[PDB]
Amino acid sequence: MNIFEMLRIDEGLRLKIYKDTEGYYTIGIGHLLTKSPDLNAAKSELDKAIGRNCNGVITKDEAEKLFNQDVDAAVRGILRNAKLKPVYDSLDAVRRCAAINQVFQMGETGVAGFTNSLRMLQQKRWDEAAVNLAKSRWYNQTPDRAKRVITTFRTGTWDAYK
Numbered sequence: 001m002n003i004f005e006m007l008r009i010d011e012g013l014r015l016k017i018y019k020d021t022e023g024y025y026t027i028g029i030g031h032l033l034t035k036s037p038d039l040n041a042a043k044s045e046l047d048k049a050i051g052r053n054c055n056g057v058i059t060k061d062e063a064e065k066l067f068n069q070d071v072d073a074a075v076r077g078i079l080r081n082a083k084l085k086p087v088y089d090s091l092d093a094v095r096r097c098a099a100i101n102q103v104f105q106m107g108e109t110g111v112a113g114f115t116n117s118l119r120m121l122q123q124k125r126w127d128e129a130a131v132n133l134a135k136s137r138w139y140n141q142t143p144d145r146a147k148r149v150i151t152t153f154r155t156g157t158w159d160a161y162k
């Protein structure tokens with residue numbers, strides 16, 4: 001297991017524009033296109049992201065290219081965030097993957113409401129952090145995924161992903 005395999009399980013792979021769990025147009029491996037309800041706006045974003053007229057459909061290679069960019073950008077964002085960087089750097093490699101996963105799903109903004117969870121993670125109070133992380137809109141809206149990510153933070157193992 002690694003961050004790509006982990007997010008691939010959590011996000012799936014779809015080659016046509018679909019709506020994510022929040023109703024937002026998305027494609028590939030969880031690549032958010034837009035929060036606009038206008039499908040034409042989503043198609044424009046897609047074409048801009050891929051560099052050709054896609055008419056709402058991409059290839060597996062194209063999906064994987066967006067995914068590589070999106071994972072890179074998520075990690076680099078954490079490093080550029082004054083609240084997230086010290087916590088991230090304090091973690092082991094497996095728990096770092098849980099942090100990347102949460103930022104990929106929620107955006108660095110959301111993760112940076114999580115002040116108390118972040119402090120507990122930096123303190124390596126793993127069971128306490130895990131309890132706090134579940135007291136969230138995140139967990140209530142996507143509980144099966146949140147449970148896997150939380151187990152990863154709690155244990156520093158890949159048990160929730162096999």
Ligand SMILES: O=Nc1ccccc1
Nearest residue numbers: 084087088099111118
């Ligand atoms: O709350 N988990 C996180 C820790 C460090 C960076 C991003 C998220």
